[PDB]
């Protein structure tokens, strides 16, 4: 349930249902921690109170 900063998208792929999945390089870690994440896991965050 926590959110981690994405440093780089290293690879993409389409599943059987035609939706995209991205191989995520997580900031602060190396290539061993890369994970394929569904498209909707990528979030843009802005300040909530301004």
């Amino acid at each position: 349930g926590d959110l981690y900063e994405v440093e780089r998208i290293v690879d993409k792929r389409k599943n059987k249902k035609g939706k995209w999945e991205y191989l995520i390089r997580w900031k602060g870690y190396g290539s061993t921690e890369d994970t394929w994440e569904p498209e909707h896991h990528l979030l843009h965050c802005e300040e909530f109170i301004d």
């Binding site: 926590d2 959110l3 900063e5 994440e37 990528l42 979030l43």
Partner: peptide, 6 residues
């Protein structure tokens, strides 16, 4: 950006 790690 950020992403869920699931």
């Amino acid at each position: 950006x950020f992403a869920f790690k699931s």
